[PDB]
């Protein structure tokens, strides 16, 4: 399976307003994806998590979602 960073450009991990790329790092639900599927380093993941929470509080990223086909 493909990791998120493998298929992506040279993007800003500190931009909480870019929903297009931050949506890639969320799961089918609103959960943040683990490093196994994001292909990020520890520092990169640590920054991404905080930017994702920032975007969430601004109503740009979903706090949680609903699972399908279950």
């Amino acid at each position: 399976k493909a990791k998120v960073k493998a298929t992506l450009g040279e993007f800003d991990l500190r931009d909480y307003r870019n929903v297009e790329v931050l949506k890639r790092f969320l799961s089918e639900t609103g959960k943040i994806l683990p490093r196994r599927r994001t292909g990020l380093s520890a520092k990169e993941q640590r920054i991404l998590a905080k930017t994702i929470k920032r975007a969430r509080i601004l109503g740009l990223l979903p706090f949680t979602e609903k699972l399908v086909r279950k």
Binding site: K66, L67, V68, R69, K70
Partner: protein, 116 residues
């Protein structure tokens, strides 16, 4: 006396009981059933067969209301949490989609001693 022709179906399954509430596309309920609505009384209500019978009874009451297309919402976990959906699929109601909306907190409340 409603002629709803379409709606939602919520399956609340626990380890002590499984209940099915068939509702309309904007949230209000139409009919419902459970393991106690049907004959079973005690722990018998938590078996998958009771969940199947409850789903089928609720689906037939929906037929009495005139239900054809059904969207499924699932909350909880227990024996027959899947058997309810299986019977609901083979009940004669065209299943639109299945959704698991089990409410999980963000670590808000302190559980009972059983749950720690």
């Amino acid at each position: 006396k409603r002629q709803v022709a379409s709606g939602r179906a919520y399956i609340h399954a626990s380890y002590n009981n499984t209940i099915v509430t068939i509702t309309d596309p904007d949230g209000n309920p139409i009919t419902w059933s459970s393991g106690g609505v049907i004959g079973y009384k005690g722990s018998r209500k938590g078996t998958p067969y009771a969940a199947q019978l409850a789903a089928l009874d609720a689906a037939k009451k929906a037929m009495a209301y005139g239900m054809q297309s059904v969207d499924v919402i699932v909350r909880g976990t227990g024996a027959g949490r899947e058997q309810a959906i299986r019977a609901l699929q083979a009940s004669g109601l065209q299943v639109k989609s299945i959704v698991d909306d089990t409410p999980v907190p963000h670590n808000g409340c302190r559980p009972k001693k059983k749950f720690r």
